[PDB]
Amino acid sequence: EVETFAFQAEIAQLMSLIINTFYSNKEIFLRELISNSSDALDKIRYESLTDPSKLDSGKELHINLIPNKQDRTLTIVDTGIGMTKADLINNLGTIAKSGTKAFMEALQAGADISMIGQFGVGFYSAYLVAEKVTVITKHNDDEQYAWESSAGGSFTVRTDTGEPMGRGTKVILHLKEDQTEYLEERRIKEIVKKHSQFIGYPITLFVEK
Ligand SMILES: Cc1c(CO)cnn1-c1ccc(F)cc1
């Protein structure tokens, strides 16, 4: 059972602007996603200080980067606090309405796409390199859910029947045909060392066959 939703008009406007605008510094998507994972790990660590039982779904706090050349996917896994169904559908989009408005006024004022994180909508930088994005997430107070969007004004949400995750978020980037450079180990190492060197959680870079 798959539910289809329409993005808010401002979010769809931001996505199409990210997909259509000519901009070569595409590597900044990895900094935003890792930064998002770092915030989710911070939130579950703080909540667990006043409630140790919130770590019963997993004690490890880490981030994993997993490239797959066969499927042409780049996956960012974190064991953070995760997102509920309400987050995926209306909560995160309501917050992002003001950040999108402010971000686009700055763009016409002289700003560039690389400061998208300062407006809280850095997740959508994934569509600099992805034709489709899948998000598997599991929050302590909800079930596991699968979010997916190929832009175009709509996204879907369903109950995930895959491998149970325990707790956290998994972002699967289905890369455009000409962006396969972000599957190479030496390229991912280079971006992480340049933009995410001081993240306070272990970042493990998987390798392939
Ligand atoms: C938005 C996002 C992603 C996707 O980049 C992964 N974890 N999170 C996240 C989830 C919950 C948070 F409180 C903060 C960040």
Swiss-Prot record:
Predominant localisation class: nucleus
Q: Which residues bind ATP?
A: 36, 78, 97, 123
The GO terms describing molecular function are:
ATP binding; ATP hydrolysis activity; ATP-dependent protein folding chaperone; CTP binding; dATP binding; disordered domain specific binding; DNA polymerase binding; enzyme-substrate adaptor activity
Q: Does the keyword Phosphoprotein apply?
A: yes
Q: Name one GO cellular component term.
A: extracellular region
Residues that the record marks as modified (N6-acetyllysine) are 43, 69
What's a BP term from Gene Ontology annotated to this protein? response to heat
Q: How is it modified after translation?
A: ISGylated.
Q: The organism sits in which domain of life?
A: Eukaryota
Keywords attached to this Swiss-Prot or TrEMBL record, sorted alphabetically, are: Acetylation, ATP-binding, Cell membrane, Chaperone, Cytoplasm, Host-virus interaction, Hydrolase, Membrane, Mitochondrion, Nucleotide-binding, Nucleus, Phosphoprotein, S-nitrosylation, Stress response, Ubl conjugation
Q: Where is this region: Interaction with NR3C1?
A: 1-209
Q: Where in the cell is it found?
A: Nucleus; Cytoplasm; Melanosome; Cell membrane
- Is Secreted tagged as a keyword? no
Domain comment, as recorded: The TPR repeat-binding motif mediates interaction with TPR repeat-containing proteins like the co-chaperone STUB1.
The UniProt function text for this chain reads: Molecular chaperone that promotes the maturation, structural maintenance and proper regulation of specific target proteins involved for instance in cell cycle control and signal transduction. Undergoes a functional cycle that is linked to its ATPase activity which is essential for its chaperone activity. This cycle probably induces conformational changes in the client proteins, thereby causing their activation. Interacts dynamically with various co-chaperones that modulate its substrate recognition, ATPase cycle and chaperone function.
Oligomeric and partner information: Homodimer. Identified in NR3C1/GCR steroid receptor-chaperone complexes formed at least by NR3C1, HSP90AA1 and a variety of proteins containing TPR repeats such as FKBP4, FKBP5, PPID, PPP5C or STIP1. Forms a complex containing HSP90AA1, TSC1 and TSC2; TSC1 is required to recruit TCS2 to the complex. The closed form interacts (via the middle domain and TPR repeat-binding motif) with co-chaperone TSC1 (via C-terminus). Interacts with TOM34. Interacts with TERT; the interaction, together with PTGES3, is required for correct assembly and stabilization of the TERT holoenzyme complex.
Concerning its family, UniProt says: Belongs to the heat shock protein 90 family.
Q: What is this protein called?
A: Heat shock protein HSP 90-alpha
